[PDB]
Design an enzyme around this catalytic site. Structure first.
Site: not given
Ligand SMILES: [Cl-]
Ligand code: NA
Length: 129
Positions: A35, A46, A48, A50, A52, A59
């Site tokens: 990760e 991301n 959309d 959002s 991380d 998220n």
């Protein structure tokens, strides 16, 4: 902070993650490897809108507030920036809430694609625990 492999295992064990909801310590270390490459400061945007955050790439559309993801929830009840500290405590507690919500570690795409069904015990071999 960029953790060493055995250093992160010991920190994770101490915070209650070994066998948490049936997932042995090797799974959490493997997921953190793919990760974030063991880096507490990692961020990724991301499609959309959002984002991380942190060692386990949590998220902002469901779990933390960053002030820039409209209509999202703050289910772990923290600012996303707290997930970036060198102290992994806030990341650990939020992760515990995530893995409990029905779908287990499948919530982490890189665990599903790169750790599930492998020999995850190798990720803690050689470490003093
Ligand atoms: Cl499960
Ligand atoms: Na949010």
């Amino acid at each position: 902070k960029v953790f060493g492999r055995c250093e992160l295992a010991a920190a994770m064990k101490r915070h209650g993650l070994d066998n948490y909801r049936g997932y042995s310590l090797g799974n959490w270390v493997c997921a953190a490897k793919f990760e974030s490459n063991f880096n507490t400061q990692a961020t990724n945007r991301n499609t959309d809108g959002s984002t991380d955050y942190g060692i386990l790439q949590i998220n902002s559309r469901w779990w933390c507030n960053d002030g820039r993801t409209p209509g999202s929830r703050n289910l772990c009840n923290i600012p996303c920036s707290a997930l970036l500290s060198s102290d992994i405590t806030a990341s650990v507690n939020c992760a515990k809430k995530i893995v409990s919500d029905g779908n287990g570690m499948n919530a982490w795409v890189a665990w599903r694609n790169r750790c599930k069904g492998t020999d995850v015990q190798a990720w803690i071999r050689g470490c003093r625990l």
